[PDB]
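target protein:
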Amino acid sequence: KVFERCELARTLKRLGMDGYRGISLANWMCLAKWESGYNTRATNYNAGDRSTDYGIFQINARYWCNDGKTPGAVNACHLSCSALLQDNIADAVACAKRVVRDPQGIRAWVAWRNRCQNRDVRQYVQGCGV
């Protein structure tokens, strides 16, 4: 499922993402935008280390979910990576919350640093009623 911007903004707010571990809703929106373009079925194989990124937040199978094929991987979110490809983003969100509970926080995703950090990210939530 490819979410429309404001539809996603409202969904994330309802799932309690706004301000989670100090991360504003607009940062989560900027992250989803650059990681997958708000697409829940997006998957990306990283040939260099044999890991795959899954879903809307492109969560890495090496640490967060289990797909069985990633070498020396853990499943910190205790989910099958398949769960991160559903239209219903409840599991992807619960797992993203787990990722930011780590010391790096939102910085865990390099795309956030490159395209969201220290930028005016208001645009992602403007007009969405959140």
User: Anything to note?
Assistant: The CA atoms of residues 66 and 80 lie 5 Å apart. DSSP finds four helices and three strands in the chain. The longest strand covers residues 43-46. The helical segments are 5-14, 25-36, 90-100, 110-115.
